[PDB]
Design a protein around this ligand. Structure first.
Ligand SMILES: O=c1c(O)c(-c2ccc(O)c(O)c2)oc2cc(O)cc(O)c12
Ligand SMILES: O=c1c(O)c(-c2ccc(O)c(O)c2)oc2cc(O)cc(O)c12
Ligand SMILES: O=c1c(O)c(-c2ccc(O)c(O)c2)oc2cc(O)cc(O)c12
Lengths: 211, 211, 210, 204, 211, 211
């Protein structure tokens, strides 16, 4: 009964779902999945997601996985509550397509690079691993290209999909929160519109709740 | 100025768009982008997609890129013509979410593996390279797990998102067409429901048109 | 009093925690948030300029390096709780034999056990697929170390002699993790090593940190 | 006659093809289907037991290894078409100078150019570099210094030393690694000269 | 009978033991283990150290291996002879712990780095192998961080464990002797207290004996 | 002497040149280039070889590098002294091509494998380093395939290029000398013609001179 999220509060993909729920002021339960004990690779979690990845999700009888399918579900199902995470006119098909391009770009261009950069610079340090400075330089060069495109985009519009905050922006937040604690931060601060966009989206109450 | 697709007829992502257009019986122009001459990495193509990847797309004044954003746009904008590529009740939000899970899974689990297997076994030959049999074995093991999940899913429903053919199924077609010309074919034929599903979706007139 | 600055999941931190519990000492565990890089910032760097958990405090005495901290606990609080030194702690040859084993844990066991844990547990957190070649290479190394331990444990009940000491204790946290992986088989296929693992992991101080 | 058993896209096969065209020789290209593992089966293994394209035939003479084949072509058909040896081919010191360059192409250039051309052509196209470019830059700095002193790498004329680079360079010119060539004025001229040759354009 | 060291006079770990024996003015025999013939990886050396590393050690019936266990044994067993290698008040437990921190740091932070640097720059050169300049640059950056810490430490105290020379200092000597014959030398000379410390500990008669 | 070799006596490539000079009974000077002091990476060595590798070579005013270009030069320039290192009829172009195939095969197929096997089993073991048994097994499998080809070849002819000893055989000698001091020896002894060939070429006076 009600809304449940099956994940881990440090997980980027889990936080993506958590932020959207808070944006909608929805009540939910966070059911912790213990990644260190391989709980995500065992039953009964595998019955919620056979690919063994956090998060999984429940709204009454509806069972979901994949963070970006979950956020979009939340944005449609609870459209008329809290922050609107869709475009202002959500029935406008061309406007939706524009938001969708950005969501695809976050997934394909931004997320894999931002992840490697977080792994090399934060998570390797945890254990006993030295950060490979060549990977860092190569990935930062890739991230810089992505952010150059974003800079051009944000000269034209207040947010990535148009004049309002949407899922396109929201999906970037968790990876950005981690990158802000690394020297990769400079890539954001050296680009004026990107920098303002990062400051706006990370200062939101829903973003701060999961941090 | 009607519908234009800027891509290459051999490209998997381009074919994804082409199949959807044909499913809708839409008229369009395919404008050839010459990948061999790096036309995708030059202006004016970069003004249609700053990431330098085929396909880009145009419908009148609307300019898009990312194959799966384009197909979705087609499925909504031209919903009431040709094959319905959305769920039967397209305003059902839970049902949309279920289709979206499958589209995410195709993108994250299927496509990277099916693409490597096509590169190693088909497209390395184009450049005079030999196929690395270790990569082939490794990627086939991954593909087998994905297809085991699909097999279980297709015991329960006729197609991956439910009773009816949708974008979830369509998105797999181009990679599958290529994999059918390789020994990786056995992974599909080994699995009775998967095999039927492949035979159904590849025999469709829209699928055969791009082949 | 006694403070430990670390993280309860950390192998090195657990090494110190187990020794404190073995001595029935009261202490405060002050959490250092590794995910936020707290270990690479001040004020933690003023306790350990190498940016590694754990650091440690006993009144005015400030320490780091888990195995230096354990030793000290064993000496400073020798006459309370479990004796973590040799039975006759003033016997110099007997101390040297314990010290060989502590050096071997550090050089031969720990780096290998740590790679095996990273590949098989901690990569799975994050997105990453375990490199099966590293796992096979490291397991071959670990097998050689454990063959030496097996021979040793045919002669003596524990690694330094007839009693449980720091030499055994220092292995416990890495072993607790490796027991949750298929590397477990390397322990179970060696009868004396298997018994030794079961004995040291079942200790109340070991179970406390798990 | 002359037969080449290989694949037209293959760098090593193209090396042989260019030398044959330079000599205006007639030959048959017999396609070996790498995708079906034809190179790892009989009867190709009876032409090269190492299972690599190209293999080669001139009448009864059976060869493999591209750089042995090109050199054979340069000697056997010396007085026809382009001279691929040094001008005075009986000058032993001059030959040795050409041979140094042929070794350098094989050891220093080819492994690096090969990784690069392939990592990138394929990133650009099917969605699958800094270390190798740094290595290539060193090799090209040496070539730049060399080409300040002489028109081509072995001296004043085009030889096997230059020819052996062509196929890898043709691929690298379709990638951003092109900048390493254009950054270096003498290298850039050399690349333009050797890639514009009719024999080079024939295999492209 | 008596004290025997089973090792090789060029070995770093062997020299560690030799320096401590000379500091105590002890008589001993060095029994040569021929590394070039793999004598360390054969019986009977394996019966003295099953890990196949020099040195092994004997004091009457007591059989040892691991250089730092051997040096500590020497420092305790023969405490009241020659140079005191322990702290001035050797029964002071906190003072011992401070020496032990430094010994742990030498082992974990200094030695693996110094050792890679010596292998790359000196030992590969003996056999005509080429030094990997990337490893050298990477490891020097690490060594610089360790030596910055040592510099700060040596501003406060004359030696690393306090006011007197101890095992903490001694354990560094052999690696340093080798690194002084390489360009890595500059890392010691550019740090004024480190440089003084190096000059003091390498000019000791026991240090010069093994050089 | 008119002839100088700038190298290191342990270096496989240097020894290749040395053996050829001794085969011709030529007088020469070996100048030992000090790798430990980075002499190979400094002027004036870099004027002999801008790639900073041993050997370089001088015959009067002629300056060369690359071992196999040097040996070939020696074989031509001093053809009618000492051992003939070319084919019996050195002007026979097809016969030269057959020798050239073998020299290419040594370079590409034999040398990189034999080198790794020597590094893993000889160079590393001397120091502290554990020989990676997976690399050894992988490389031995490759070497076995090469030696199977050689076995078939040596059933047909006395040496690898035909009836007489040539550069094709000579170029293998230094790597083989090292591999004979390792368990990889078995790969040579288990193949009867290969074994006879190894015994013949390693027992030559010129081969023994550099050992
Ligand atoms: O219910 C949903 C929905 O109606 C649409 C939608 C509507 C108009 C469009 O133009 C469009 O592209 C998508 O998207 C979704 C996307 C998801 O990921 C999940 C959903 O539950 C919906
Ligand atoms: O106080 C300590 C001490 O006395 C000894 C010691 C005693 C006898 C021996 O034979 C020996 O090898 C070591 O070790 C220590 C090691 C530490 O890290 C911390 C300590 O406080 C002590
Ligand atoms: O002087 C040389 C020479 O004449 C030839 C040559 C001659 C006839 C042939 O058929 C052939 O293939 C090569 O090769 C060489 C190869 C070198 O590396 C160095 C040289 O100095 C010569």
């Amino acid at each position: 009964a009600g809304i449940k999220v099956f994940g881990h509060p440090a997980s980027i993909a889990t936080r993506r779902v958590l932020i959207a729920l808070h944006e909608k002021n929805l009540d939910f339960e966070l059911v912790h999945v213990e990644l260190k004990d391989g709980e995500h690779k065992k039953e009964p979690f595998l019955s919620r997601n056979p690919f063994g990845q956090v998060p999984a999700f429940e709204d009454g009888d509806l069972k979901l996985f994949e963070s970006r399918a979950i956020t979009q579900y939340i944005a449609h199902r609870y459209e008329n509550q809290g922050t609107n995470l869709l475009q202002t006119d959500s029935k406008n098909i061309s406007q939706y397509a524009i938001m969708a391009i950005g969501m695809q770009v976050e997934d394909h261009q931004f997320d894999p690079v931002a992840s490697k950069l977080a792994f090399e610079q934060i998570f390797k340090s945890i254990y006993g691993l030295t950060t490979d400075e060549a990977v860092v330089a190569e990935e930062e060069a890739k991230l810089a290209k992505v952010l150059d495109v974003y800079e051009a985009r944000l000269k034209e519009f207040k947010y990535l999909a148009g004049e309002t905050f949407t899922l396109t922006d929201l999906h970037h937040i968790p990876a950005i929160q981690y990158l802000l604690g690394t020297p990769t931060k400079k890539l954001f601060t050296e680009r004026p519109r990107v920098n303002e966009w990062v400051a706006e989206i990370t200062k939101r109450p829903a973003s701060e709740k999961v941090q």
